[PDB]
Amino acid sequence: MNIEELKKQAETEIADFIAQKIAEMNKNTGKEVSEMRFTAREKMTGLESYDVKIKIMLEH
Amino acid sequence: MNIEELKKQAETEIADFIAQKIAEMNKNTGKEVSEMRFTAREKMTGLESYDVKIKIMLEH
């Protein structure tokens, strides 16, 4: 499998995982996720992950 | 379960999923993921997901 295909595959997997998490959150809270912040988690050995902060909105 | 706890849970799940994907990619390519770009995928019904673009670096 080539590098491009691996990349597109993982991109789709992550997008799909995030979509499921948002659907789940919206369902469970009765509210709406408006945004997620992603902050790189980097080590001397390189990028490890992104830490996530979920923003949920509600009526004033 | 409260809204805060649900949030922290989903944040951790997403961070962990991304970390696994990066470890996987690095292993499979012999290279290094340097960055991921996240671009909101929004609909009139609200935020659906984030689309992802993975950047991989290699030696000049």
Query: Technique behind this structure?
Result: X-ray
Q: How far apart are CA A47 and CA B24, in angstroms?
A: 13
Q: Give the β-pairing of A32-43 and A46-57.
A: antiparallel
Q: For chain B, how many helices (H) and strands (E)?
A: 1, 2
Q: How far apart are CA B40 and CA A15, in angstroms?
A: 10
Return the number of other C-beta atoms located less than 10 Å from residue A59's C-beta: 4
The separation between CA B5 and the C-alpha centre of its own chain, rounded to angstroms, equals 20
Q: Which two tokens stand for residue B23?
A: 């470890």
Return the number of other C-beta atoms located less than 10 Å from residue B46's C-beta: 12
Return the number of other C-beta atoms located less than 10 Å from residue B22's C-beta: 22
**Cβ contact (<8 Å) for B38 and A50?**
yes
Which residues constitute the domain of residue A35? 2-60
Where do we find the tokens 């379960």? B1
Q: Which two tokens stand for residue B28?
A: 């499979």
Q: What is the resolution of this structure in A?
A: 1.8
**Cβ contact (<8 Å) for B56 and A7?**
yes
**How many CB pairs lie under 8 A apart between chains A and B?**
104
Our count of domains for chain A comes to: 1
Q: CA neighbours within 13 Å on the CB side: how many for B30?
A: 3
SS3 B44: coil
